[PDB]
């Protein structure tokens, strides 16, 4: 392949879809690495990690949501240009729970500087493994594609 896949477990909403690459959802709510009003796409380096970040970390099991596994195909030359943040080089406090100013500010500086289109960050759940942030405003984000590949059905609170 000349692409590398990252993963979301996402829903359709009223004004954006599960395969959105505009960062509409995170723009509305904010997140660990972005302010309300700043659009960013959050994806995980494995499908397992997407489940931990999306379902387990927010304890959202048991909701009758129509969740989709979304594959985000990132051009390898764009990934090669990504910034890599690690627990070792991030500012102290990036892993605060609830997320606070350190990670949000770091993410904001990265987004507004447009240093790179992609930022790889550690997960607060498993710091050794990574999530991907995509800045849709960055010129280099051109060529990234997203598609629903199947329903996501694994729900630890599912009743048989």
């Amino acid at each position: 392949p000349v692409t590398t896949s990252f993963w979301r477990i996402a829903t359709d909403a009223r004004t954006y879809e599960a395969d959105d690459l505009s960062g509409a959802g995170a723009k509305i709510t904010g997140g660990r690495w972005n302010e309300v009003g700043v659009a960013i796409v959050y994806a995980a380096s494995s499908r397992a990690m997407a489940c931990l970040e999306t379902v387990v970390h927010l304890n959202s099991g048991g909701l009758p949501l129509n969740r989709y596994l979304v594959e985000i195909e990132v051009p390898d030359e764009v990934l090669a240009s990504a910034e890599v943040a690690t627990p070792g080089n991030l500012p102290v406090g990036w892993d605060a729970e609830p997320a606070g100013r350190v990670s949000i500010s770091f993410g904001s500086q990265w987004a507004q500087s447009q240093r790179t289109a992609l930022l790889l960050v550690p997960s607060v759940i498993v710091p050794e493994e990574t999530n991907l942030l995509i800045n849709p405003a960055h010129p280099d984000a051109k060529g990234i594609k997203a598609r629903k590949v199947r329903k996501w059905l694994y729900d630890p609170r599912m009743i048989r």
Binding site: A10, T11, A26, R32
Partner: protein
């Protein structure tokens, strides 16, 4: 003031937009969620934060992120 009705409404709107409302008991689901550790908030039960306006905002944001897909 807990303002559970506002959180229930938020949850009902989310399921209406993003899932299936038929058969879904939102106050029942919210009751359990509020009383279970929320890893995104460091393992605290969301109900314990509803005594301040700041805590209310934090819990509402976490609930909203269930739909938005921002990592918390």
């Amino acid at each position: 003031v807990l303002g559970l009705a506002k959180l229930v409404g938020q949850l009902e709107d989310m399921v209406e937009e993003s899932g299936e409302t038929d058969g879904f008991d939102a106050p029942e689901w919210l009751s359990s969620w509020l009383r279970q550790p929320l890893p995104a908030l460091g393992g605290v039960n969301p109900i314990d934060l509803l005594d301040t306006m700041e805590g209310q905002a934090v819990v509402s944001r976490a609930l909203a992120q269930i739909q938005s897909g921002a990592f918390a």
